[PDB]
Amino acid sequence: ADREDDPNFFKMVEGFFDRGASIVEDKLVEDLKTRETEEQKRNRVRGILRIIKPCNHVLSLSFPIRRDDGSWEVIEGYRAQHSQHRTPCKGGIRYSTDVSVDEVKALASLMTYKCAVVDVPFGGAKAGVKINPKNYTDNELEKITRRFTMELAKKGFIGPGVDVPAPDMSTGEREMSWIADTYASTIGHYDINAHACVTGKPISQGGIHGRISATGRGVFHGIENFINEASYMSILGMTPGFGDKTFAVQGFGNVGLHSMRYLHRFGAKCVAVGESDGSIWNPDGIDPKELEDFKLQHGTILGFPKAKIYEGSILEVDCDILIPAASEKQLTKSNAPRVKAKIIAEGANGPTTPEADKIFLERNIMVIPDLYLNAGGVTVSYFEWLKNLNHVSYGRLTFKYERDSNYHLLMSVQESLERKFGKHGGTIPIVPTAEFQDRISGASEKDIVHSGLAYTMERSARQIMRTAMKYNLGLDLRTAAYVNAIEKVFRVYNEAGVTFT
Template sequence: MYRYFGELLTRGAGGVLASGYPAAAADSVLPASASLLRHRGYSQAVDPADDPNFFTMVEGFFDKGAAIVEDKLVEDLKTRETAEQKRSRVRGILRIIKPCNHVLSVSFPIKRDSGEWEVIEGYRAQHSQHRTPCKGDVPFGGAKAGVKINPKKYSVSATLPRRPALLGDPCGPGIDVPAPDMSTGEREMSWIADTFATVMGHNDINAHACVTGKPISQGGIHGRISATGRGVFHGIENFINEASYMSQLGMYPGFQDKTFVIQGFGNVGLHSMRYLHRFGARCVGVGELDGSIWNPKGINPKELEDYKLANGTIVGFPDSTPYEGSILEADCDILIPAASEKQLTKSNAHKIKAKIIAEGANGPTTPEADQIFLERNILVIPDMYLNAGGVTVSYFEWLKNLNHVSYGRLTFKYERDSNYHLLMSVQESLERKFGKHGGSVPVVPTSEFQARIAGASEKDIVHSGLAYTMERSARQIMRTANKYDLGLDLRTAAYVNAIEKVFKVYSEAGLIIT
């Protein structure tokens, strides 16, 4: 039932461009960046039909970043080796970082309502175990999972989600920690946690940390549901308020008077829309599979959410008109593809009118489209940074589960009392100095400070931690872009930044023994 595909090192970083030209002739017809990739043995990994699979896209973006950062990694390597030996070591480590380390495939039976039995397949890919448990870089090794099924065609049955929890050793609080994604949520995560705790973790006090995105009553954390959309907002915020980037786009900093369009009105799209609307941007269009709506005066996110809950669709939303054509090509300042991968390709990249593309979905832009956007001076805020809000707050939930106490519980009352004592001390000091005959000099906090005096709730701490994480990561990407003179190529800057961090762990933690 369990089949390991093993270490996929054959998919290393040693591929070269397929071409009928001799090497020198090929370099002469390729752009400088492509020539650099070829010279260093990295593959561009771009499908001629511009329809690569997601893994191939990531490999191509990795290769582009690796080619740029290689010289710097060689220069910073502190070993007693020749320059050629150092370069060989760097390239070897990059080849080890690039492939997916393990893929686990499971098959399990379910009984449908009709009485028919069906075999369902599931997968878990652990890209890297350089830091465990496997979970997006927070700061762990990356992993992803999926079950090959359309949940809309099956009835709710505990039999279905409980089977993947019986993976045994590959999963656990210190090994691999899944989280919700498309077509899954709190319910499914609760099922997995309960099954793991019952079957595998009955002697492990941390068993419920085996998965994140759970309901609050099952060890979840406040702010997790909206985390990805809130992260999208913070990611856009960090770049839209940066004058140096906005000047290159011919725009003024800030959200005021900015228009945006969202493709996909699921969890990510809804919460992204909600926060952008709250801070002054105007949503003029929303697209879904069954249709798109348009209103240049603005669409209210709460009203649209209520309408969809009542009708099961956004089509026919009052005060809006159906949008003919692709909503991706609508006129706006910010485009947020928050649906599925490969929505922006070379076939429509020239038609995009937005000046900022904020990738709320995973892999919405193909490599060829990405290159077209760079040539057109369009700022693409990459998915690997922008939609990391969910996994960041999942990390906070994992820490909460290991600590067995909610954020703020141990300090909430102490901080509140300390703040009030501070105000009383200030008031008494003023009265002694300026009060007439012991008259009162009241010290009254502002409404904003009053809210903070009350003490930080778990949600406040989560929101603050997420905002700080997104800001810190944005600054790292900006510094990397400036350091390597990448201009608006934030995707390559993000990959370079990630490669540098993972390379440092591999080099210094003894993961490479020679």
């Protein structure tokens, strides 16, 4: 944590909201079409906005575990539900000591708008268990998450139609596998959609292909849709395309390692990788498979053979693209001036504070907002959810038919040409290309996740680029996204009676 700029997390995000609130407030009043045409529209609007911002529910939990050494310990744990204009709430579970109600109240709100950015029909939620996970044995961490699932389940803070958790900092597949198993074996025992109570699950447990990457893949697609738009690259003095760029990732977690993977593939170079014990550095480039193989073996990126330890801030590393994939409030009024990079891809949830945004705005530094960029996590989870509702491995019922249908479709183009060009004209083979033999049978689960994600990271980037052009926000994409989110979320409340009253 910084000290000059350590603003309250929930209020920080409220700040981003209130900015977007004013910018559409005019429009919201204008398409509102009611017979109370006045400032009655504006105060109805202002009221509905005042309903949106604050979380609807926060549950606070002091529950006992018995540690491995026979002793008793009390665990603090929270889960804020921000909005519910879309049931079920969505949002991850975070294991940290940083965990605090305001931090979960903040992340939950982010999940509300984050889903509105990428048109996932979930209300925002989040949750923290206030433990250093590296200080508990795996059997302790199991007892902890299972128990946390119960106490959440009993008070209605996890359920396939109510609230669907997912992984986050220091939680992953393993934790999610537990959360399902408790609720499948206990309270959700008769629930057919039980297993749909939580995403990020291991594939064998009902998870969806590529969800672990997903968030980092979406990070790729997000940087891409902009870095291939010279209208913005003209404003950063940078060339369109990944081919020649250099980047740096703070954090090497599920968002870091895979944001590094998907860029080091589709073009650019990794220069430096951070972690909560220090960074490594190499301007020549760092291979993600080597580094990961070194973090698996030795549990730290420090001392990488092919990369010098970097003395100094990872955020300040000279590069093209800065990807904070760590915790929040990392780039602040004091170090934001020194960032000597040109694209900020917020992988992490709110890693940049509003005072860093004003510096980055001035310094013509493009911050790709947290709302849009890591929405790949929720999006693939949103798929994982529909998978557990449709109870089928995607693609299975149809494969051998949009297959045979295609081969018959092709055989029509063929017979029709032969039918016209007689025998003499020859026989005219109509045959799938190489990049159509791989789709000849249609959508597999792998593919849907990719294109389904690819679509809406591309789809929702335009919706932002539209709005940044429209209201003339330029490189203030963060306000551009909150403008879209605030509008979509409002769209529900307005056409609803707003409350059962």
